[PDB]
Design a protein around this ligand. Structure first.
Ligand SMILES: *[C@@H]1O[C@H](CO)[C@@H](O)[C@H](O)[C@H]1NC(C)=O
Ligand SMILES: *[C@@H]1O[C@H](CO)[C@@H](O)[C@H](O)[C@H]1NC(C)=O
Ligand SMILES: *[C@@H]1O[C@H](CO)[C@@H](O)[C@H](O)[C@H]1NC(C)=O
Ligand SMILES: *[C@@H]1O[C@H](CO)[C@@H](O)[C@H](O)[C@H]1NC(C)=O
Ligand SMILES: [Ca+2]
Ligand SMILES: [Ca+2]
Ligand SMILES: [Ca+2]
Ligand SMILES: [Ca+2]
Ligand SMILES: [Ca+2]
Ligand SMILES: [Ca+2]
Ligand SMILES: [Ca+2]
Ligand SMILES: [Ca+2]
Ligand SMILES: [Ca+2]
Lengths: 533, 97, 49, 272, 259, 265, 95
């Protein structure tokens, strides 16, 4: 569950590729209340480029960005505003009367249809457009406009004039995003809306030609002499003004942030480690905290809310954990395939098993046990375990810290999740049960064999512990033999409680933690203090 | 090239509720209990429904974007936040006992 | 399982954001459509005075 | 069918006939020309179709049959739809006309032709009336006695006959039941039929767009009833009337029930 | 909260002759009545008459109104028992029915911002009531993608006209489509209002023709309630004496508000 | 008398066959003939109706139970045929150029159609089953169809240029159109002088009886080109006069009425 | 113009390579590998060389995966279960 979240990150890694593709082909806190009113007055431009010859042929009639700067009244103050209108995704038609130099030819001219989209960047000298540096949500409700094309005559020096007329489309507001206007010394943060085009009744046509009953709006005279087109509405915007002790609300948002750069985030984690409780933590460490539930309580910024899970995933599949997993899978595959020329490095067990191939040894049984235990961390996020599955506790600590820690940011949470997953409980032990005989092991080179009912040690049977841990399910050492025996001695323990502690059952664990057993509280506090970062 | 291909109106949700209330009770019980033991994943749940559409533009995403606005999801997130807060340091409300 | 479908909707809720990013980015990085002209040639009259 | 039916009060049966037809309903409005006149639009039919689509009715199920006047509509009303709604304007000088239209369409009639000249007819029960349709129907009637003479009239002088219809298109005549009458009708311009009233027509619904309830469907003056499918509205515009009808069509349709006797296009059956 | 009871208890005394002393009555009469009567002390007269029935002198109020439409324009009924006298006019049938639909029923009303937002009706009781000196309303339904149906979202001429020069309007449209509107906001204010349980505190009395009021917009009920009454008239003194004498019946047909 | 419902009927196999309802059904029923003008033209007699009535009177049919109803031509008859009697006979002349129209007439009267209206200016219609056809009546119907694709665009036709539509009728007084069931069609029709109705063919009408007078049996009632059936009330005769035909009908009126059966609806 | 077949010879050569590598597989390690929840990443990270900056392989394989007997049979089964659950008047008509 709390390890299922890591398994799900690894599983859904395949979305990072398409996210990067999209990005490539594209390229204490408080709250302030916009939902203020606006009126956007804009207009189009055109770019006409004629060919030489006798003057009967054009090679381009295309659209062009168009700025505009005006003033209007809002809530009793005259505000100066500035718009910039452009288009994307248009149909390029062409007319051709022949190859002779005297035949009417428009080699390419643009028309915006329902498959096009126009963008209108907006800006004014109000307070919102300097306060919108950290946004939580943005959405606008604007009325529609109907923009119609006007009369346009082609200057043919000889003969009759072709008259471009008709054409009309309806802009309705659909989509709001942020943008920037780049000045000579400073930059301005702006709010660009996207209107969708809906074709209308008036059909564009080119007189004295075989073109008629053609809908859309071309670039010849889109404004039809109108000085501008005007939409009116309201824009709703939420802010993340980094305020403080509950007074002195900023204005202009009055802040810089950690973009000037972990050295102090680690100290925050090491301050928040021990404050965490244990009973509620065990109550939280059994919950399948999938992507939504893990990334809901984060009051993110408008960009982090869009890319948070993918942001952490693109770094989570770069780490020792992911690389070790891929290495293990490659080892298993190459072992199942290479048998004829079989990799004969080592096999501490009945036969060759990738889980039991000691290597990189830069006591012998201690080394073997530690090396075999460095792969039970992979068993944990491979679902061949039975108990509290230590990575689950690590993820519970993670989700309990990143909901409190003030210092959380879009660039920041990535590689924090991974440093957590990598450095939480570095040393950790596991056990396997077989005919009432428990064989333990730990990455710190320690092994303990012992019987369930009467805890008394036994020689550690290697080449059997391996044969069992390879295939049989594994368990975690939350209740490891040292503390287990201390408990069975001082706090006299029953058969069922001991079996459930071997199986690492949260019911009996939380029951002891509520019975105030210091020989378990100390162990859980040790696990917390190891989950330090 | 037309004026526009309008998208026809769809229903009144009251009347759609009444269509369900018309399909109140005629479900078979053996077959329903056999249906409710199947991982009817996104493909299986959105493939067979009405067998006719050209767009196919991620209607699983289109239902998810309305799914994560409701009481269920907000309650899940509320519960997770409460668990994390209470665990970490947070004072239990006087009304909470 | 039949509730795993709800759990899967929840888990895969993140793709709503990717779809919104598609919607906003493709419309800024869409290529102008170019028509394939008809097999004929739209000739007409000559310059008449 | 004569055989019986059974039932219960504990069951939750759920077992019932399922089949197909024309696509699960049809609906036909009958609106006056005045409505489209006031509206002055040529897309309002499609507007109302796409509205009804929200209430569930698909595209090819709603129809409109404009009628210029109540009398013109009364002249051979040919209703062939699975649901019929009739908007009807109030005019105190037309009460009898728009009650005869109601008594004709709301109720189911079984009509036999009549030959005025060669024969003298009579009524048997309180449901055997004489309905006459055409362009201008002037009817005159002379009751008769046991010895085949007249009573306050003369078999020869048509002027002595008693007048009951003057310049009417639809007439529904009830005379004394149990005596032979001699009739004089403008047979060139009108056709008269001896009709019998049967169980009601649950497929039509009248909507008096204007003034208070006046329709006395039952010719007997003691009942003066008002049925579930006899509605009233108060109006100052027609768009609001149609929006009301559309917002509340499910109640209209809960008040109307498909036919039982048979399929037919007119407002009465012919059985010679 | 829940309320229990029993059938073995006995009936209590008549709350009449105490509700009269601890309540107020308010007649709403047309200027025609004052004109035809042509007297300055008819109010004192009627109050001294009520004083026999038990209504004291400082409990009965008379609140004149020049016309049914001027009354329908923001009617501020604030009394513990309200009686309205309403003339009959075929040309004013829908207006005098909307007045009834407004006062007899208690409305939970929210404001409306046409120019910035588009609205829809959810249930059969979420209507749009406009009040003012001269209202002229036009509506354009929309589709799922904000396009007009038989209308154009910008061209106001293509809208569908439902009211013209009406001082009060009660508009019901198809419940489930988003509409755009055009209203004379200068002269008329419009509210989105859900109809709650009836107002048991007002009593309409139609002085003239037959019962025409159809409160229910649905054309199936056409109900006639207990406090929608009728009278036939040739003078006004007879009407007022009838009201006086049968006020106890009227106040038994009315019931003090719960809100 | 539970109308509007359909209940299981039951019986036995030991009950005996009851009396002959003939000589009573003739009295409590009516018989309407539909002859062509050519018959009375050839005849040139004013009392032939009273003659055939006095002849029927021997077979049992009383005097005022028989009716004759003329029709100038098969197409003028196809124009809104209103058959309201208890036993209808229709004498039909053969013409190789009129074959399709006199088969459409048969498919219209022999069967019982449930007819809903149609409005072409608003909607685009499709067929659902193989018996949901479009019958057009009037004085001169000129019907054109343009099928549409999944995305509401024509197939070999344009939704504006009516000339590109596909023609199925050209100035016909009666037409019965079947098209591909599963595709929406846009229609052009002379609404002023023709009414089109979308009708579903229900079970047959056992109340009429067509009698071809001339050529071989050609009438393909069933629109599908597999059955080509010959129903029981689809009669043939070979003629050189008309008196012989009427005498044949009168002498064998009992077999005709045995082939017919009073309606259900 | 448009082609009418492609990729068949490459797919045949890969068929041969698979039907010649099949036999050299071992059994113990295969049973060890068959208990591994080999998610998308586990299956598409350990490719032989990640040959050259490939596209999203999950999408690439899925856009072919959802046209085959397996997925269509899954859909058919779910549709049959839903259709059997829907009505009771049919009478279990699948025999
Ligand atoms: C240290 O933590 C404890 C509980 O975790 C808290 O009560 C105490 O106030 C903290 N110390 C400071 C200086 O905040
Ligand atoms: C209707 O179906 C249910 C379950 O299929 C059955 O129990 C009931 O008996 C059926 N009704 C009748 C009248 O048999
Ligand atoms: C109710 O009326 C009776 C008779 O009029 C009287 O005796 C009794 O006192 C009254 N009740 C009270 C509470 O005064
Ligand atoms: C039935 O037919 C027989 C033979 O003609 C006759 O004797 C008998 O009377 C008939 N039945 C009745 C009820 O007349
Ligand atoms: Ca009349
Ligand atoms: Ca007389
Ligand atoms: Ca009578
Ligand atoms: Ca009004
Ligand atoms: Ca409503
Ligand atoms: Ca309009
Ligand atoms: Ca024909
Ligand atoms: Ca067909
Ligand atoms: Ca063609």
């Amino acid at each position: 569950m709390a390890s299922l979240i890591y398994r799900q990150l690894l599983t859904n890694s395949y979305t990072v590729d398409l996210s990067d593709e999209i990005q490539e082909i594209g390229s204490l806190w408080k709250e302030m209340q916009y939902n203020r009113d606006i009126t956007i007055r804009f207009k189009f431009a055109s770019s006409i480029v004629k060919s030489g010859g006798l003057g009967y042929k054009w090679s381009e009639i295309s659209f062009k960005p168009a700025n505009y700067q005006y003033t209007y009244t809002r809530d009793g103050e005259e505000v100066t505003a500035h718009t910039t209108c452009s288009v994307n995704g248009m149909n390029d038609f062409n007319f051709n009367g022949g190859s002779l130099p005297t035949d009417f030819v428009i080699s390419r001219y643009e028309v915006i249809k329902e498959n096009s989209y126009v963008y209108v960047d907006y800006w004014d000298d109000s307070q919102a457009f300097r306060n919108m540096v950290y946004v939580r949500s943005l959405a606008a409700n604007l009325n529609s406009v109907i923009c119609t094309g006007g009369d346009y005559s082609f200057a043919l020096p000889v003969g009759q004039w072709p008259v471009m007329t008709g054409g009309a489309v309806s802009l309705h507001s659909a989509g709001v995003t942020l943008s920037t206007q780049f000045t000579d010394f400073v930059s301005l943060n702006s709010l660009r809306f996207r209107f969708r085009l809906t074709v209308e009744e008036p059909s564009f046509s080119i007189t004295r030609t075989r073109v008629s009953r053609l809908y859309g709006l071309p670039a010849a005279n889109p404004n039809n002499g109108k000085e501008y087109y005007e939409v009116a509405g309201r824009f709703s915007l939420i802010s993340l003004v980094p305020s403080n002790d509950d007074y002195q609300t900023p204005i202009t948002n009055s802040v810089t942030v950690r973009q000037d750069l972990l050295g102090e985030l680690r100290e925050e984690f090491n301050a928040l480690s021990q404050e965490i409780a244990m009973s509620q933590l065990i109550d939280l460490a059994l919950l399948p905290l999938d992507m939504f539930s893990m990334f809901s309580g984060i009051k993110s910024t408008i960009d982090a809310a869009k890319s948070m899970a993918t942001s952490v995933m693109k770094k989570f599949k770069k780490s020792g954990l992911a690389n070790s997993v891929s290495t293990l899978t490659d080892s298993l595959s190459d072992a199942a395939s290479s048998i004829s020329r079989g990799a004969s490095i080592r096999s501490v067990g009945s036969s060759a098993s990738a889980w039991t191939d000691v290597s990189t040894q830069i006591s012998s049984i201690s080394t073997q046990t530690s090396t075999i235990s460095r792969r039970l961390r992979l068993k944990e996020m491979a679902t061949q375990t039975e108990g509290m599955n230590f990575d689950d506790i690590s993820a519970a600590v993670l989700k309990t810290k990143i909901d409190r820690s003030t210092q959380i940011s879009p660039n920041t949470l990535p590689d924090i999740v991974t440093e957590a997953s990598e450095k939480f409980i570095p040393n950790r032990a596991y056990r396997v049960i077989n005919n009432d005989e428990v064989f333990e092991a730990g990455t710190d080179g320690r092994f303990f064999a012992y019987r369930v009912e009467t805890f008394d040690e036994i020689p550690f049977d290697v080449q059997k512990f391996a044969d069992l841990v390879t295939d049989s399910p594994v368990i975690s050492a939350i209740i490891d033999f040292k503390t287990l025996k201390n408990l069975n001695d001082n706090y006299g323990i029953s058969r069922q409680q001991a079996f459930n502690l071997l199986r690492s059952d949260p019911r009996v664990l939380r029951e002891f933690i509520n019975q105030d057993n210091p020989i378990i509280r100390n162990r859980i506090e040790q696990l917390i203090m190891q989950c330090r970062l | 090239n037309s004026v526009t291909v309008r998208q026809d109106l769809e229903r009144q949700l009251g009347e759609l509720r009444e269509e369900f209330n018309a399909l109140s009770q005629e479900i078979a019980m053996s077959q329903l209990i056999d249906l409710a033991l199947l991982p009817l994943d996104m493909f299986s749940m959105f493939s067979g429904i009405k067998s006719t559409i050209d767009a196919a533009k991620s209607m699983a995403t289109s239902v998810m974007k309305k799914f994560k606005k409701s009481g269920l999801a907000n309650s899940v997130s509320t519960l997770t936040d409460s668990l994390s807060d209470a665990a970490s340091s947070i004072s239990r409300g006087a009304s909470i006992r | 399982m039949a509730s795993l479908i709800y759990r899967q909707l929840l888990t895969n809720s993140y793709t709503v954001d990717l779809s919104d990013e598609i919607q906003e980015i493709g419309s800024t990085k869409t290529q102008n459509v170019t028509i394939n002209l008809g097999p004929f040639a739209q000739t007409g009259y000559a310059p008449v005075n | 069918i004569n055989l019986p039916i059974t039932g219960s009060m504990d069951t939750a049966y759920a077992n019932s006939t399922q089949e197909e037809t024309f696509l699960t309903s049809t609906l036909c409005l009958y609106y006056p020309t005045e409505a489209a006149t006031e509206i002055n639009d040529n897309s309002w039919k499609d507007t109302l179709s796409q509205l009804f689509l929200t209430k569930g009715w698909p595209t090819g199920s709603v129809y409109f049959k404009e009628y210029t006047d109540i009398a013109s509509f009364s002249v051979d009303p040919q209703l062939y739809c699975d649901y019929n709604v009739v908007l009807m304007k109030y005019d105190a000088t037309l009460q009898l006309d728009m009650s005869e239209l109601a008594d004709l369409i709301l109720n189911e009639w079984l009509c036999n032709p009549m030959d005025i000249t060669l024969y003298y007819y009579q009524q048997t029960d309180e449901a055997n009336k004489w309905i006459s349709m055409g362009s201008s129907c002037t009817i005159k009637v002379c009751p008769l006695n046991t010895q085949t003479l007249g009573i306050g009239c003369l078999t020869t002088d048509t002027a002595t006959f008693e007048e009951v219809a003057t310049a009417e298109k639809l007439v529904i005549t009830d005379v004394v039941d149990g005596v032979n009458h001699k009739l004089d009708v403008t047979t060139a311009t009108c056709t008269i039929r001896n009709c019998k009233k049967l169980g009601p027509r649950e497929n039509v619904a009248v909507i008096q767009v204007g003034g208070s309830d006046v329709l006395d469907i039952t010719a007997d003056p003691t009942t003066a009833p008002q049925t579930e499918r006899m509605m009233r509205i108060n109006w100052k515009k027609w768009w609001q009337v149609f929006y009301t009808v559309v917002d509340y069509v499910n109640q209209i349709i809960q008040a109307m029930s498909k036919r039982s006797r048979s399929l037919n296009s007119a407002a009465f059956y012919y059985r010679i």
